[PDB]
Structure formats: structure tokens, C-alpha cells
């Protein structure tokens with residue numbers, strides 16, 4: 001079958017798996033903040049960080065590329081990851097990127113795509129024999145484009161968790177939800193034109209400047225599964241419009257005490273907590289493993 005090593009191989013074949021870098025989302029910065037849920041969130045989940053208290057929040061804004069030197073101005077996926085610290089010291093992560101849905105419904109599908117995406121031999125050719133294997137992708141371009149827009153700022157675009165998570169409340173009630181991190185700032189993007197002229201790391205510079213002006217806010221929203229919404233296929237579009245705000249992440253500045261020495265920082269979608277369980281999503285379950293591989297490759301060097 002498919003192994004973590006293989007996943008890393010496909011990733012490396014796309015320019016990723018660089019030394020001392022995350023196999024993917026190599027380029028990214030850490031920020032400090034806090035999170036406070038709405039008064040009602042505790043009715044959806046019993047998770048400690050959702051009870052209404054304020055908890056520490058570590059955020060990483062990144063470019064999806066495995067290339068540490070990726071150009072902010074070039075097309076690509078951006079990722080927003082939040083690590084919540086619970087009262088007892090434990091932590092639970094929320095991982096999200098700019099795409100509305102996943103390009104594939106399975107890990108194999110995603111990996112097969114990262115291989116046929118490799119440069120050299122016949123790039124535009126093999127990156128087609130895939131379409132034949134995965135029809136679903138022929139109508140994707142529309143979403144793919146949206147997921148690669150060049151945001152004017154990491155603070156002016158929204159991120160999605162894609163996978164469905166089962167939220168259990170103290171009363172025993174449960175519901176499946178998909179995560180969405182929306183900005184309180186107006187969403188805003190740059191045309192390919194402007195994007196080209198921008199500094200390689202303009203996104204890092206603008207956000208540093210934005211925070212010196214004041215905090216940046218993102219509302220955490222959960223889209224609650226409708227009667228026919230798949231809880232196992234992150235590529236499947238959901239019909240439900242029952243989307244509610246359950247909290248806000250308030251980012252106040254760049255972090256400086258983290259990732260010094262043998263300190264490792266990894267946002268694992270599987271790092272849930274009491275009151276939150278993972279769905280039988282094959283992509284979500286495979287991630288934690290391929291991540292361990294990636295974390296290993298960068299721990300040593």
C-alpha cells in the first residue's frame with residue numbers, strides 16, 4: 001500500500017523535503033495570540049478550549065510549497081495553523097489552508113497527483129494521465145484557481161480545515177463539522193500583475209507591519225453537516241449552510257520564544273482533545289503519519 005516514506009518521496013519530487021524544513025509548507029512564520037470561544041460553543045463540544053475561557057494560541061502562516069524560498073507573489077496555497085494550549089498544559093491543533101475542498105478524496109489520489117506533478121520527463125503529459133484516472137478533477141480548475149490567488153495579506157483571506165470532525169458536548173450530543181477561519185478584515189487579493197512586482201516575502205513584511213498597527217482577528221466557524229454531507233470525503237462539497245461562529249483568534253504579534261534548541265513545532269490535524277474526534281476520513285488519518293516522517297527529517301538536521 002501507500003507508506004509515509006513514499007508520500008515524502010513524492011513531495012521531495014516536487015521540490016519539497018528540503019533540509020531542516022517541513023516537507024511541505026516549508027516557508028512559514030509563527031505568531032502569538034489567544035483564543036476565546038463564544039458563549040454557545042460549549043453546547044457543541046466539551047473541548048476545554050471551547051468553554052468560553054481565553055487560552056494561549058500559537059499561529060503559523062505559511063506557503064504550501066516545499067520550497068523555503070517560495071515567492072509570496074507567485075500563485076500558491078497559503079496555510080493558517082493554530083495550536084491551542086489547554087488548562088492542563090496539553091495542546092490541540094487546527095490546520096487550515098486556502099482551498100475550499102481537497103483535490104482528492106484519498107491519500108493515494110493526492111500522492112499520485114504529487115508524482116505526476118514532478119518536473120522533468122513529461123510534466124504536462126503525466127499531469128493529464130491523472131485526469132483520465134480522476135475525472136472529478138476536470139471541473140476543478142475553478143476552485144484550484146481560487147485556492148491559489150495571491151492574498152494581499154495573510155490577514156485578508158480565509159482558510160479551511162476540509163476534514164469533518166465529530167464534536168461531542170457534555171450532554172452526549174454529537175455533530176460533524178468542518179472548520180473555517182475567516183478574517184474580520186476585508187478579504188483582499190492582488191492580480192497576477194501586482195503579485196509579480198512584489199517582494200519575495202512581502203506577506204511576511206506586511207503582516208509584521210499590520211500587527212504593529214494593532215491585532216489581527218479571525219473568526220473560527222464550524223459548518224455543521226447536513227443530512228447528505230459526507231464526513232469521510234474532504235473533496236465532496238457540503239450542502240449545509242448551517243455555519244456558526246464559535247470563537248475568535250486574536251493575534252497580537254510574532255512569536256520569538258518558540259523553535260529554539262531541540263524545540264519542535266508541528267500542527268497535526270489528528271491532535272484533537274476531549275470533545276473532538278476525527279472522522280473516518282482516510283486523508284485526515286494518513287496525515288499524522290506523513291507528518292511524523294516530515295518532523296523526523298527536520299529534527300535531526
Ligand code: HEM
Nearest residue numbers: 022023024025060062079095096097110161266290294295
Ligand atoms: C494526504 C496529503 C497531505 C500530505 C502528504 C501533507 C503533508 C504535509 C507535510 C509533510 C507538512 C509539513 C509537516 C511538518 O513538517 O510539520 C504539511 C503541513 C501542512 N499541511 Fe498538509 N498534507 C496533506 C494534506 C493537507 C490538507 C488536506 C490540509 C488542509 C487542511 C493540509 C494543511 C497543512 C497545513 C496548514 C500545514 C502547515 C503546518 C505548519 O505551518 O506548521 N495538509 N502537510
